[PDB]
Design a protein around this ligand. Structure first.
Ligand SMILES: NC(=O)C1=CN([C@@H]2O[C@H](COP(=O)(O)OP(=O)(O)OC[C@H]3O[C@@H](n4cnc5c(N)ncnc54)[C@H](OP(=O)(O)O)[C@@H]3O)[C@@H](O)[C@H]2O)C=CC1
Ligand SMILES: NC(=O)c1ccc[n+]([C@@H]2O[C@H](COP(=O)([O-])OP(=O)(O)OC[C@H]3O[C@@H](n4cnc5c(N)ncnc54)[C@H](O)[C@@H]3O)[C@@H](O)[C@H]2O)c1
Ligand SMILES: NC(=O)c1ccc[n+]([C@@H]2O[C@H](COP(=O)([O-])OP(=O)(O)OC[C@H]3O[C@@H](n4cnc5c(N)ncnc54)[C@H](O)[C@@H]3O)[C@@H](O)[C@H]2O)c1
Ligand SMILES: OC[C@H]1O[C@@](CO)(O[C@H]2O[C@H](CO)[C@@H](O)[C@H](O)[C@H]2O)[C@@H](O)[C@@H]1O
Ligand SMILES: OC[C@H]1O[C@@](CO)(O[C@H]2O[C@H](CO)[C@@H](O)[C@H](O)[C@H]2O)[C@@H](O)[C@@H]1O
Ligand code: NA
Lengths: 174, 359, 363
């Protein structure tokens, strides 16, 4: 059905990429991976890799939820961008590291008017060379709607805990 | 096609219903922006700022309005029974967008209806998803949450963070947030990012996970012990921020006098629900009350205390709820009557009261 | 050994010069502590907080000073001129430890001398690596750099952090802190905690590597040169939302960092916080003890900033005095004797047993 990978596979994919766009969601918050995340972001940046974080207006469970934690993790406000400045990029980025996020990436909300998120803007992640999702199960988010992206020829899943996984990827890269 | 934003006359209001960005977005959609001089000075937005975006400037709530096709305001207009008549300033049959406290203010709803106007009660936005873009309740109650801490911190002697100093160690401040909502969460967050040992409590234990996700720490006949486990925490708390608000009803009591007496002196309580009763019977709307060694801060119109940031938001909340309807090219409005939002918003249109709840 | 701490009487002083933790230590050193009713009731230190530590409570200052050999206070005593003569309460020939503000208050130095009162001016602790646990200046101008930011945000009409929301993205404040001293350093800390974007500047460049280490950025050159620098500072003050000034100079007037010229060039709603206000302030419009609005900017210049953090500062003022008097206490004969060879008792003492032993303006 869906492609699944391991922390060893993400390491390779990202240690060799050019541009990468980290998409943080409620998941990372729930896991408190702001640090594993930024930690990693550095390793990438040390390999000459381009990194930037994409923040969906409602990613998280409160306005600016991804922000506090990303700041708390000491993340450069010039590497953090908002939906209307970032989307225009994905289609020029080798990877779309989506950690702990779902609804904010669902393309359904641009399509079938029946879906509970229809009308809401989203981050065109499915435009990046290869897309990665770092959640635990195959469950959905708040909208509880299945994400059509999990089953694409450029989508690999990286099952695990937002933090425990990023830690194993940083680990693998080193 | 004129869209006009007056100036806030309700006492204490410092927010405006517009921004320079919003102007261009409206201007682009074939609109004529009109705002009465210095209608946003309280929100750090100057006439110059507007006029550069494309807005023209009026001299009176009146001379701003006259033939205003659609009007933008933050707080419901004033009936004459209040000493000023703004409703009667709105060209009969225009479109009013603002927060009308609709369900509570019948008197004002009819004043609009009599001038045959379509009023869109923004505080009734549908709890959907596409709508989150146009929610005024959460964009304002968000900053409120931030402010609660900033204001609670101000009224507190001791510093928040834990500091390392040759004179020893300065321990952190212990914050406790009641009700984990948009407001509450922001409280928790900023409180913690400041260095406090934040800890929340809510009746919906579905929040324990949201709280925890903010570095917070949730607290846990049922209330015989729950309402008690709280005591053990409140007794060692420096800031007590309460934000529980259940609409059309007096806010529920979270902190009773009996409790403020059992608290540590010097402590402070922010009662954001001060207006709807206050989660603490001692909180008086408007100023700070001191009792049992505790300061019980109960300000009013807290978003106005962030009036500068809260405004450009409250504007978008509108600009959003609006543009879908500014018909493609015909250059008019077109309120899709079936459109979930509109049929949840509008309380009275060209004639009489349309909302269900009013009938 | 009768030690006594009295309640501060100068207007706008909430700090006390004692903590319960300390009374507990002082009795340890073999002292008898005495505080006057709710002396730190403004520092959230309750009397029965102290009776528990061991200190005795006195109904009046006059009584809680009568038989005291050493006397601990926060601010310089009141002369008979000023109003109520406190000096006359200290036992002739006795020890006074407190922030004398000696270098600019002879009237108090003279009126003390005449009582054979030996007074140590704590604000004169020498800047030595080993004296740090006894420097009141730092253990106060620190809480001050904190409060600066707090009162700075409280008078600010926006929110500090960056928040990407459904209603648009709320941007961060942009602080600018002139003076990277003890307070300036904390100003930066507290500022970034709130998610703001910090900018700082200082003459002593040893500062830079410190600013960057907390997260901020140092206003630098692109490569007489004196103004090529001062110019850039403006390039940033136009963007600034809050300006925290803490630049001081030991001795007299506070330097000027923000000329009313520049205030006029700031964004409407900006807020300036002058900590040097009681020395003219690094900004002329900083009228002391009041916010002042001009050119659409708030010039916030509160007085005695440390008191604004009473509860926290006091415990630290009382731990400083302790770290200074503890050495000079023989352990077993439970008696005290201020050293002399101790650089500490040297550059701090302004008058002893009748004469002005200090080389300030009497050496
Ligand atoms: N932020 C705001 O202002 C608010 C937004 N909302 C709504 O909430 C939604 C936001 O979406 P988005 O932020 O993408 O969140 P989602 O609701 O899409 O959830 C994201 C994912 O996190 C995963 N997750 C949870 N914990 C962990 C963990 N420890 N490790 C790894 N993965 C984890 C989940 O799956 P799994 O179990 O598979 O791991 C889940 O699918 C939208 O529908 C939005 O409108 C609601 C209120 C407020
Ligand atoms: N679309 C849905 O599935 C759906 C439906 C209904 C409600 N909601 C939720 O409604 C929430 C409400 O907003 P808010 O918190 O900004 O506004 P509010 O005025 O409802 O906030 C009051 C809050 O404090 C808490 N609280 C503490 N004591 C309480 C009491 N006695 N009664 C009621 N609440 C009490 C609540 O959790 C509540 O959110 C949002 O955060 C949203 O997620 C979602
Ligand atoms: N007792 C001790 O051992 C002790 C205690 C604390 C700090 N220190 C040291 O003292 C220094 C800091 O100062 P402080 O707080 O003690 O003294 P202070 O109050 O004099 O310091 C504030 C700062 O103002 C700056 N300044 C003055 N005029 C200026 C101008 N025109 N433009 C730009 N900057 C200007 C200085 O560079 C100075 O660091 C640091 O180098 C620190 O490490 C020593
Ligand atoms: O410390 C609170 C904060 O409020 C002010 C306002 O003038 O002080 C008031 O509240 C104090 C209690 O916290 C009182 O001790 C003080 O007398 C009263 O004026 C500020 O000075 C202070 O920062
Ligand atoms: O944003 C400023 C902040 O200061 C307070 C303090 O009470 O208000 C003062 O400053 C306002 C100007 O911004 C005045 O309009 C107001 O009357 C004055 O008290 C807070 O209310 C406000 O959040
Ligand atoms: Na801001």
């Amino acid at each position: 059905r869906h492609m699944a990978g391991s922390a060893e596979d993400a390491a390779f994919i990202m240690k060799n990429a050019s541009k990468v766009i980290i998409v943080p969601g409620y998941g990372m918050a729930v896991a408190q991976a702001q640090h594993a995340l930024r930690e990693m972001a550095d390793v990438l940046k040390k390999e000459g890799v381009e990194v930037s974080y994409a923040i969906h207006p409602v990613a998280g469970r409160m306005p600016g939820h991804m922000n506090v934690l990303l700041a708390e993790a000491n993340v450069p406000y010039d590497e953090v961008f908002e939906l209307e400045e970032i989307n225009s990029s994905f289609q020029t980025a080798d990877v779309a590291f989506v950690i702990g996020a779902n609804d904010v990436t669902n393309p359904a909300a641009k399509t079938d008017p029946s879906s509970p998120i229809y009308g809401m803007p989203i981050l065109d992640v499915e435009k990046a060379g290869t897309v990665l999702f770092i959640k635990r199960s195959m469950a959905s988010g708040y909208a509880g709607v299945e994400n059509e992206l999990f089953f694409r020829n450029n989508t690999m899943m990286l099952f695990g805990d937002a933090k425990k996984m990023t830690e194993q990827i940083v680990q693998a890269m080193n | 096609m004129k869209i006009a934003i007056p100036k806030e006359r309700r006492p204490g209001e410092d927010r405006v219903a517009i921004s320079p960005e919003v102007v261009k977005k409206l201007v682009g959609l074939g609109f004529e922006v009109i705002v009465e001089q210095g209608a946003g000075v309280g929100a750090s937005i100057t006439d110059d700022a507007l006029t550069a975006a494309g807005a023209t400037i009026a001299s009176t709530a009146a001379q701003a309005l006259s033939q205003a096709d659609v009007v933008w305001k933050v707080q419901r207009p004033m009936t004459a029974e209040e000493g000023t008549d703004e409703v009667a300033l709105i060209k009969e049959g225009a479109v009013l967008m603002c927060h009308l406290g609709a369900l509570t203010n019948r008197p004002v709803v009819e004043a609009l209806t009599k001038r045959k106007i379509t009023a869109y009660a923004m505080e009734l936005m549908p709890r959907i998803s596409r709508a989150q873009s146009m929610d005024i309740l959460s964009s304002q109650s968000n900053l409120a949450g931030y402010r609660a801490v900033i204001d609670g911190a101000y009224e507190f002697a001791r510093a928040f963070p834990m500091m390392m100093t040759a004179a020893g160690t300065v321990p952190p401040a212990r914050v406790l947030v009641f009700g984990v909502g948009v407001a509450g969460l922001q409280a928790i967050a900023t409180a913690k990012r400041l260095g406090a040992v934040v800890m929340a409590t809510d009746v919906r234990a579905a929040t324990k996970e949201q709280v925890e996700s903010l570095g917070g720490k949730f607290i846990t006949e049922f209330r015989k012990k729950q309402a008690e486990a709280v005591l053990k925490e409140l007794v060692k708390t420096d800031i007590a921020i309460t934000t529980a608000l259940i609409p059309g009803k007096p806010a529920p009591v979270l902190i009773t006098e009996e409790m403020v007496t059992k608290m540590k002196p010097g402590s402070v309580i922010i009662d954001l629900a001060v207006e709807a009763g206050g989660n603490c019977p001692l909180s008086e709307p408007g100023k700070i009350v001191v009792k049992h060694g505790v300061k019980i801060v109960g300000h009013t119109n807290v978003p106005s205390r962030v009036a500068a940031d809260a405004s450009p938001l409250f504007a978008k909340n509108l600009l959003n709820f609006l543009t879908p309807h500014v018909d493609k090219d015909t250059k008019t409005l077109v309120m899709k009557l079936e459109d979930e939002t509109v049929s949840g918003t509008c309380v009275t249109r060209d004639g009489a009261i349309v909302h269900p709840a009013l009938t």
